[PDB]
Design a protein around this ligand. Structure first.
Ligand SMILES: CC(=O)c1cc(=O)[nH]c(=O)n1[C@@H]1O[C@H](COP(=O)(O)O)[C@@H](O)[C@H]1O
Ligand SMILES: CC(=O)c1cc(=O)[nH]c(=O)n1[C@@H]1O[C@H](COP(=O)(O)O)[C@@H](O)[C@H]1O
Lengths: 257, 256
């Protein structure tokens, strides 16, 4: 039988990062991840502060921040702790294991030092996960595997998706879920996060495709919606975030019965 | 089979591909150094010393502890002096709207200094359309990852065929592939092959190695990409020369 987020947080094989997430989702009545796709640190932080109470997670693309510093990420962590959300760097690691370990720990971004969660493509084989684990496990972090993509012509289908699920289930000490369009694992210890979400039908001019929160959470059985432009391009980002939160949360409840 | 110099003149050749092919012929090198280091000073010292031996220097900018745009300016100076291209191995792999910003912007401003970048094809062709919005105006080229060297790679069969079709349909920007072998029969595309060492072996995190003779001679690729085989050696110049000579002779042999 289908379990609430709060009960899933207690499952025997739950990862600590997933448990923390699931608990705050239930506490705050939110399964919304804000995709904070902005180029200005000040806007990132103003969004994180104002929308923090409405979100379970803030997803970053640190490599698009024109004025990235590690101090910016310190300020973001303060907001994450204050408002209770996880930080997810959407880095899409996708190289051989030896390379991704350095890309995760080092360089200018030092992603592992501030990101609760990262994601990885499965195309290199399981070495990508083993490499990331060498950094992530000691730093008490989690990882999401990209099992499906939202964009037109995605090759993350069929056997590829099945491979991502197997890879996750075999690295459960580090991998806590998926980026996917629907439920892809039957194991309730895994999170499903779905991008390509807007209230209205449509897409963008570079292959993005949208589905609604009701469709993704209610019909397709995903856990969390990831929303960027549907919120960020709106005049009132707070009201937009609230609309998305209420949509995703009610769809979750209804599926739960 | 056409020489690199003849391929540089093909009707449908991309200007970046042509520049590369001409300097490969001129310098007798089809070696790409994978400069997998964390210090700018080591990067630049390798680029200067090994520049005459290489057709290309591949970077992972996001592992450089002391990256600045001025470091990349110095690398360009070396690239112009010694005549090699700069390839940032970023493996763009997101939706089109996102990758365009990751390519043009942020701290790294990759498009401002990288002649070549690469991309995974898993998102569908929007990844290439997004990149080309930035890269076409900046006269850049791109490589699509058709195959990977690592154990368990899913870049096989229909996935590889999709990479080839995507390249062939974006030939104004895509100049070739990262692959383990020749994957396109069209001589205007370059094939660059990582997972290369002289000796048999691998690493502890899924990397698998094949020799330059195997990759260039038997598998029909154009360029070898070599990191640790050179970088971990005491004398990196002599190591680079060993790889250069291996790859170049394998190419000549195939050419007949
Ligand atoms: C989250 C993720 O891994 C990813 C995968 C994918 O298939 N689709 C997608 O849009 N994304 C990302 O989500 C965000 C979608 O933003 P949008 O709502 O279209 O403005 C972007 O920041 C994408 O880079
Ligand atoms: C170049 C490329 O796209 C790539 C793809 C791949 O399938 N295998 C691979 O090793 N690479 C990269 O080449 C280099 C190989 O370095 P190595 O010679 O194993 O020390 C690394 O910097 C990898 O990130």
């Amino acid at each position: 039988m289908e379990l609430s987020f709060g009960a899933r947080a207690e499952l025997p094989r739950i990862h600590p990062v997933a448990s923390k997430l699931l608990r705050l989702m239930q506490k705050k009545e939110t399964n919304l991840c804000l995709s904070a796709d902005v180029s200005l640190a000040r806007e990132l932080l103003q969004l994180a502060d104002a929308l923090g109470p409405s979100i379970c997670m803030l997803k970053t693309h640190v490599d698009i921040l024109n004025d990235f510093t590690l101090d910016v990420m310190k300020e973001l962590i303060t907001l994450a702790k204050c408002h209770e959300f996880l930080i997810f760097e959407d880095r899409k690691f996708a190289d051989i294991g030896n390379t991704v370990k350095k890309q995760y720990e080092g360089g200018i971004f030092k992603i592992a030092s501030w990101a609760d969660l990262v994601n990885a493509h499965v195309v290199p084989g399981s070495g990508v996960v083993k490499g990331l684990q060498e950094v992530g496990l000691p730093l008490h972090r989690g990882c999401l595997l990209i099992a499906e993509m939202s964009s037109t012509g995605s090759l993350a289908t069929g056997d590829y998706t099945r491979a991502a699920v197997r890879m996750a289930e075999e690295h459960s000490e580090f991998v806590v879920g998926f980026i996917s369009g629907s439920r892809v694992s039957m194991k309730p210890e895994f999170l499903h996060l779905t991008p390509g979400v807007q209230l209205e039908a449509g897409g963008d001019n570079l292959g993005q495709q949208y589905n609604s929160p009701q469709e993704v959470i209610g019909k397709r059985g995903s856990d969390i919606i990831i929303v960027g432009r549907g919120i960020i391009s709106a005049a009132d980002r707070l009201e937009a975030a609230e609309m998305y939160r209420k949509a995703a949360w009610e769809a979750y409840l209804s599926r739960l019965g």
